[PDB]
Amino acid sequence: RPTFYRQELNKTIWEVPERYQNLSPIGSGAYGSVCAAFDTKTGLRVAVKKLSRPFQSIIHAKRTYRELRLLKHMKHENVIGLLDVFTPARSLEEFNDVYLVTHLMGADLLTDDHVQFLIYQILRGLKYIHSADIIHRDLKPSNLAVNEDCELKILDFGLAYVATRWYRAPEIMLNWMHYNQTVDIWSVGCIMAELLTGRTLFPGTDHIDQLKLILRLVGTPGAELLKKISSESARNYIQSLTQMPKMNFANVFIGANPLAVDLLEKMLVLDSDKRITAAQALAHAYFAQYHDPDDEPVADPYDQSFESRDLLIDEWKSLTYDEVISFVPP
């Protein structure tokens, strides 16, 4: 066990191991605050998220457990992974704080070769994630941390402007049909289109407007898709709206690489059974310059049985401590 040091930066208190020096506060969030930090052991710059209020409620307790379990499991070039996890607490009883340490990236979310590399990496990262039955579910430019090699990593959570709903698959925002992993692909689509044009594709001012903007482009659900809407409420809503034709995506993404536009038509379909998977998306002609199937690996199986559990603050708290204790750096 290493020795720690204390620090107040931005009204929040920080208790890290000496091995992490020069804490620079660089971003904040709903579930915590990230500091930049130099790691004396590896000689690398790293990020440190101190989870804010990790064990305040059953919802916080579970969430904290969830975050740790996922980062511990993520091992991939395009997905943010745990370099170190620690706590100033010397026992489970005192255990009140959780710090997560990962790589320092650079920034967030240009030429068609850039879009290609960036989107390639996101989709290489969603192939993996998706392979372990995980769905990012809130994929957006600010969970996409790039450095100057242009090298991408998917963040579990971003930093703090961009509305989440600007990037949500209709299905999982209007709760309107059975959803699958391909909710992230809708987002990648929305992200990809932004990189190409410079403009948010679906810059909606709320749920109803968002749906208006998506339908402008993609067209109202036809009889084959209306068929799969499970909500009495939403079928009503859709069918009542004034009917819109589907657009030619070349007329909307003009001068964009025709292969880029083909990938877009393939990602931005309402019918989540038709939508292109990550694994499929990589084999698209658009990525010819980077696609390599012997190097788009899948992930170890991931036990999310815990998601279906109702436990007590203290129990979750204990499982998390377990995961701190059971860590091994790479």
Ligand SMILES: Nc1c(C(=O)c2cccc(OC[C@@H](O)CO)c2)cnn1-c1ccc(F)cc1
């Ligand atoms: N690794 C990162 C970053 C970054 O590296 C990052 C992201 C965007 C911008 C950014 O700025 C870097 C420079 O401005 C400061 O050196 C860093 C932001 N959050 N996280 C993160 C940390 C610990 C976790 F457990 C989970 C996620």
